[PDB]
From a paper:
Here we show that [name] utilizes a small ankyrin repeat protein, [name], to protect itself from endopeptidase activities during entry of prey. We demonstrate that endopeptidase complexation by [name] prevents cell wall decrosslinking, and that both the Bd0816 and [name] targets bind this self-protection protein via a common epitope. Previously, we assigned prey cell rounding to the action of two secreted Bdellovibrio peptidoglycan DD-endopeptidases, Bd0816 and [name], that act to modify the invaded cell wall via hydrolysis of the structural 3-4 peptide crosslinks. In summary, we conclude that we have identified and characterized the first ever self-protection protein encoded by predatory bacteria—ankyrin repeat protein [name] from Bdellovibrio inhibits the prey wall decrosslinking enzymes [name]/Bd0816 and in doing so protects the predator from the shape transition that this catalyses in prey.
We next utilized a modified version of our original [name] construct (starting post signal peptide with K38 mutated to become the new N-terminal methionine) that represents a more ‘native' signal peptide-processed form of the DD-endopeptidase6. This version (hereafter simply referred to as [name]), was co-expressed with the exported domain of [name] and the structure of this complex determined to 1.36 Å resolution. The [name]:[name] interaction reveals that AR1-3 of the self-protection protein are located over the endopeptidase active site cleft, whereas AR4-6 contact the final α-helix of the transpeptidase domain (α9). The [name]:[name] interface buries 2372 Å2 of surface area, and is largely polar in nature; 13 hydrogen-bonds, 1 salt bridge, 125 non-bonded contacts; indicating complexation largely via shape complementarity. Upon comparison with our structures of the uncomplexed proteins, [name] does not alter in conformation upon binding, whereas [name] undergoes further flexation around the region between AR4-AR5. This observation explains the 4+2 arrangement of the repeats, such that the gap between AR4 and AR5 allows [name] to undergo an induced fit and contact a patch of [name] around the 346-351 loop and C-terminal end of helix α9. To the best of our knowledge, this significant conformational rearrangement following ARP target complexation is unique. The protein complexes show that the interaction face involves the signal peptide cleavage site for [name]/Bd0816, hence binding may potentially be strongest to the mature form of these enzymes and thus not interfere with secretion and/or processing by signal peptidase, with [name] forming protective complexes only in the periplasm.
Numbering used by the authors:
A (entry chain B): 28 to 220
B (entry chain A): 38 to 438
Amino acid sequence: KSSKALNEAAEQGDLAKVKNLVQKNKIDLNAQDETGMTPLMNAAMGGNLDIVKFLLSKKVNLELKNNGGETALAFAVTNDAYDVAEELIKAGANVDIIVAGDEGDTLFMRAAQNNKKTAESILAKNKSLINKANTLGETALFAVARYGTPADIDFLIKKGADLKLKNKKGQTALDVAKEASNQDTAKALSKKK
Amino acid sequence: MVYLNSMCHMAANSKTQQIQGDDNKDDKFPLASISKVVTTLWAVDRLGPDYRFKTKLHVTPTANGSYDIHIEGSRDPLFGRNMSYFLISELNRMKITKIEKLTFDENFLLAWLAEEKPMIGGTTPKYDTVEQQASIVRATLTSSFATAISPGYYTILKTKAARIGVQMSNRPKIDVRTISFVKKAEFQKNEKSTTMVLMSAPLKTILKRMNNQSNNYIADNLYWNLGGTEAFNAYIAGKMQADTSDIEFHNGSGNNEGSVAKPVYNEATCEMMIKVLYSLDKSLSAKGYDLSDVMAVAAKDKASTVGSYGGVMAGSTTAKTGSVNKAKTLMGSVSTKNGEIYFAVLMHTDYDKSRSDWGVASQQIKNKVSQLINQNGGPKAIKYTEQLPLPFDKYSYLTKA
């Protein structure tokens, strides 16, 4: 059975409260609540690194998923808890996962738009994720083409991004840059060889 | 489920000051912690960005080489562990190591974890009697202020302090025998006492820390200090000719003041958020400051909730986040090829049905702000160097009044 009190303390960043419930050890730390959450997911979503470290020391399962299909690592990345994300990746969390939303963005894609260090950590575990497409046929190059910078494009190219991919609408990354009125990435992508 | 409630924007230099956005820009929605930008404006207007909270210590020598000290509080809203460590370092610098009687009044607010989890994101304690507040301050003085200083937390602080030019003791230690509450109206300063002042960092710094962390404790205490909801309603009516239909606050932080059964959230219109940004910018500019002096800068303030706001926002965008059950929000300014543009994005979420909604909404917000930047010629880096906001600075040293 899940503990509502433990899950709340874990999200809120109350480590003392977490230690006072977990060491009493009436709680299965892998038990999931009514929306599929675990303590670890709560700690990750709340960016609570000390609590994540404490739960990792109890050898909790890293790969359980909530109703949105997200593991703790997905919660961390998507809530910009990149210190937590680094901790989870070093602890062996699967990086080949999908974050919530209609697009089915890869974890890598989400990190690529936002935190270079974690994007690099993901690729260090699986080089091919650079070109793994989402449900709509788009890679990180497409996301950065719309909403990123020429430097972001260069980062992705430096990591092996394929320039010729088309999404499920038949669009290239250059096509989507133009469509999103990103003059700087469109100019840059037009010239890439 | 995630969808937009409203988004609006306005160029800072607009001649008409017409706010652009959708048809819901004049409808109230939950703000979550973008509420803190409204509290920031109120504090900047009422106190000024250079205001310092002047905590006074009334110090009297005693027959045995110790001192009696009465703390005349200032309602400093960032007085916890780290300010206490600085105060202890300062007492030691003054050769004060033993305090016989330590007393304090009802304006001495002390919350050890003021800058730490879980107070950053928690329900700020609201003391409904002075006696309740004083009982808890006395307990914190006894169990934290007067006991062995954590070497790890102290050295982290001392290193930060040195980076901003502040000296601290290597081996801080105080002994306190008796601690008690003495109300301001009942305090009788000794003829032999000396009044020393411990000034906070300026308000802008306190605000920067609050808006980097999304610190509920700081925000709620500022709001209460300035008179709470009755005073806020009067302020905003006089400032904006606004009423309850435009903005309805119950606290300074934005978090839920009721239950999960019956929630009570600060709400306002997207238009009101733009007006708040315009007014805050105006008040700061009068003193030579920018929004980046009190609000976090995407990708530059690494120790903020926007430290990983990448893409075209990085280095161009000054913004405050918010997250509650039914909302994910962002407001601030973007610096573009075309100039400074104010924005606010109010999303709907159902975090209680699906905890993944915050992350989904967050990236949708980032993409909407990035689109706004794209449509104004791309980003322009603001002039900004990452700040290190502490509760004290080089003018906080204990000094005779």
